[PDB]
Write a protein that binds this DNA or RNA. Structure first.
Ligand SMILES: [Cl-]
Length: 513
RNA sequence: AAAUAACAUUCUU
């Protein structure tokens, strides 16, 4: 027959080319991969009317969109900094495109236009899980039971699809009935048991803290696992680290990665490490235990991982640090120096390391720690981004020992660094830092006097807003940081009746905008 | 059968 022959042929070449790229270890291949996705998705809306659009072709497309989500997340962490929320970014639009593309395919399956296999069903539901749509995963799965096409309905009931579903079902129902029945069948079964069924059942038992059943299934999973498809052992192993409430079992599995004890490769996934650090802090309140695990993670990473990974780790660590030393900047400052010395001994210091430290140090409300971090950027020869200059301006809102001159200086140096790094206009995060250093500080000191029972920063704030308005990303930022900001900080309302007639006296000196 | 993917520091509007 072949009415849609050319579109079917190009779809197979497209999907296979991009799937091979995303499974093998800007650039022409990078551009090909992302253009192959839009083209394949474009062909999908035409080929869904064809009868030769089998479950295999749909499943290969769903897998490809899944790898697109994986690649988009990877690209976000490889950047020198996260893009501003209010500006255009490849990460945001590509994520929405993949997500919307996955919605259209899920709806076409729930209606019956296209068929899907158990392999395609798992990538569809895993994708929606990675998009934080757990409840939608349960609806799609249970709606597959009452489908006309019994073949696709049977695919959603295959063991590997059930394996993905078990952790979501235990989160909702908290029922161990169906899991324990499956445990009795699987432990003594001589038949083929899909590794993803092992994985989901292990994860349930880890959350349920029935660790003996979790470790027993884990041993069977290991002896049966195939070298080419060993990733099931990675998910379960990491689950023991980040999900086990028994910290002694979690740390043993953590050491198995540090000491390279396992027969399979495994990444020290920072999300898993962060959850492990948080569980130690919530359960033990032992900062030394948190500090010892953080030290092992930093030495494990070294220079092998992206700076965005260590940034996420240091975020968790310094958040715990400044909660522990919330009322002790004296012993805290000595401990920070030990942390800086250790971190220097592992690798060259990255900027997010000091950015997180400076951000969280606002609880101390002292100027010495601000000048200490600012000095260390130059001392350790840190590649600078605009994040530091934003935080250095924001930090002035947590101390009283400063003047409108220093607020201007740290604002001017931020605008300079914006144009030095080729930034187009002034983003929301830039104005939010100036607002936090003026309006929030003034509202804070005002609320203290009411609760208790270079003289004005709000005037400088409104002067810079009006002076630098033509450099804004959008003129709607004027309403956002004036009338809209007054709804949250009412002390701005008493300065705003005469904003239209206000004059400005500042010192811009731009370059590239 | 077709595994595995770190959601980072600065951003209420
Ligand atoms: Cl930057």
């Amino acid at each position: 027959a072949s009415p849609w022959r050319h579109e079917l042929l190009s779809f197979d070449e497209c999907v296979s080319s991009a799937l091979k790229y995303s499974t093998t270890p800007k650039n022409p291949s990078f551009a090909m991969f992302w253009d192959s996705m839009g083209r394949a998705m474009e062909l999908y809306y035409s080929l869904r009317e064809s009868p030769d659009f089998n479950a295999y072709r749909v499943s290969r497309l769903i897998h490809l969109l899944h790898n697109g989500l994986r690649s988009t997340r990877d690209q976000l962490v490889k950047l020198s900094r996260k893009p501003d929320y209010d500006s255009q970014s490849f990460h945001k639009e590509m994520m929405n495109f993949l997500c919307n593309s996955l919605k259209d395919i899920s709806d076409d399956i729930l209606i019956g236009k296209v068929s899907v296999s158990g392999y395609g069903a798992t990538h569809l539901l895993t994708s929606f899980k990675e998009l934080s749509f757990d409840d939608d995963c349960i609806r799609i799965w249970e709606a597959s039971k009452n489908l006309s096409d019994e073949t696709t309905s049977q695919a959603f009931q295959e063991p590997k699809v059930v394996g993905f579903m078990l952790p979501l079902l235990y989160a909702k129902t908290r029922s161990l009935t169906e899991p324990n029945e499956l445990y009795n069948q699987i432990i003594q079964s001589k038949e083929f048991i899909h590794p993803n069924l092992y994985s989901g059942l292990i994860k349930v038992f880890i959350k349920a803290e029935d660790y003996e059943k979790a470790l027993s299934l884990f041993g069977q999973l290991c002896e049966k696992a195939e070298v080419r498809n060993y990733g099931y052992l990675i998910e379960t192993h990491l689950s023991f680290i980040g999900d086990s409430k028994n910290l002694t079992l979690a740390e043993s599995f953590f050491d198995k990665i540090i000491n390279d004890e396992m027969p399979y490769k495994i990444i020290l996934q920072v999300s898993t490490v962060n959850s492990f650090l948080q569980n130690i802090w919530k359960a033990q309140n032992d900062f030394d235990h948190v500090y010892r695990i953080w030290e092992k993670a930093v030495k494990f990473y070294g220079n092998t991982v992206n700076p965005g990974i260590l940034s996420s780790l240091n975020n968790t660590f310094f958040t715990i640090f400044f909660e522990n030393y919330i009322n002790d900047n004296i012993n805290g400052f000595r401990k920070l120096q030990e942390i800086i010395t250790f971190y220097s001994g592992v690798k060259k210091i990255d900027e997010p390391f000091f950015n997180v430290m400076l951000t969280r140090a606002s609880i101390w409300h002292e100027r010495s720690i601000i000048d200490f971090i600012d000095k260390n950027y130059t001392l350790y020869h840190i590649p600078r981004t605009i994040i530091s200059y934003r935080i250095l301006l924001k930090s002035l809102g947590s101390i009283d020992n400063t003047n409108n001159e220093e607020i201007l200086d740290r604002w001017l140096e931020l605008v300079k660094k914006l144009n030095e790094l080729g930034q187009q206009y002034i983003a929301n995060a830039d104005l939010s830092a100036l607002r936090d250093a003026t309006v929030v500080w003034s509202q804070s000191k005002r609320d203290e006097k009411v609760f208790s029972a270079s003289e004005d920063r709000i005037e400088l704030y409104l002067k810079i807003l009006k002076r630098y308005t033509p450099y804004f990303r959008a003129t709607k930022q004027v309403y956002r940081y004036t009338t809209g900001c007054a709804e949250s900080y009412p002390i701005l309302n008493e300065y705003l009746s005469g904003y239209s007639d206000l004059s400005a006296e500042d010192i811009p000196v731009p370059q590239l905008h």
